[PDB]
C-alpha cells in the first residue's frame, strides 16, 4: 500500500496480534 503511513508511528500496534 503506497498510501500507508510512511512516518514513525509510536501509536501503531506494538503487540504480536491485532
Amino acid at each position, epitope marked *: 500500500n*503506497p*498510501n*500507508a*503511513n*510512511p*512516518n*514513525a508511528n509510536p501509536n501503531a500496534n506494538p503487540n504480536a496480534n491485532p
Partner: antibody
Amino acid sequence: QVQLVESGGGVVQPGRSLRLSCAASGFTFSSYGMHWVRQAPGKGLEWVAVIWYDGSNKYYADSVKGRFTISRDNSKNTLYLQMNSLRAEDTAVYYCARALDDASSTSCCALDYWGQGTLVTVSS
Amino acid sequence: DIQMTQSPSTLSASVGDRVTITCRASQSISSWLAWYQQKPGKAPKLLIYKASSLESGVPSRFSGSGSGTEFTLTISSLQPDDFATYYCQQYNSYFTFGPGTKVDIKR
C-alpha cells in the same frame, strides 16, 4: 525552523544521469517519510516517489519506474533521488517534501513542508 | 489512475471577496484530499488536509469542504497575498494533483 535545502540540479543531455539531494534540518528527519514531486515549466505538480522513514518501503510513479531511485541517509539527514536514463520529458523543477503526520488519518499523504526546488533541464 | 480536475482555470477576484474554487476526482477519494497554494517561482504550501482540516500556521479565512468526488476550497475574505495558484491533491490511491486554479486581480 524546518528547512529542506535541495541541490544537484543542472543541465544534462538525454540518457545521462543526475543525482539530487535534499538536506533537512529543524525536525527529526529519520521519523518522517519523504517525497519527490516535480513541476514541468509552465505546468502543474506531479508526484515522483516516496520513501519510508526508515528507508524500508519505496514507491514510484509509473513515468519514472526503472529509471529513478529514491534513497536516504538518516545519519546525514539527506534525501536522494538518483535519476538515470533521463528524457527531455523529465525537465522540471524537482521538490522534496515531508509527509504530514496526521495521527487520526488512515491514508497518506499530505505534504506539509517543501524544499525550495532544484531545476533539472534535460536537453540535447 | 485517479484524475483530478479543477474549475475555474482563472478566477477574477478583488480583496475582500468570498472566493470558492472546486476540485473533482474521477472516482471517490473519501476525504483524502489536500489543498496547496503556490506563487510564481516559489514552492507549494499546504493549506488543507483531509478535505477540511486547516494546516497549522494557515490563516483561518481558509477552509475546505467536500467528500467523494466534489471538493471546495473557500477563502472567506480574500487578502492581497492570496492572489496565487491553488492545487488540490488526492491521496486515496497513489498521489495525483489537479491542474490548478489561478486567482488573479479583478479589473
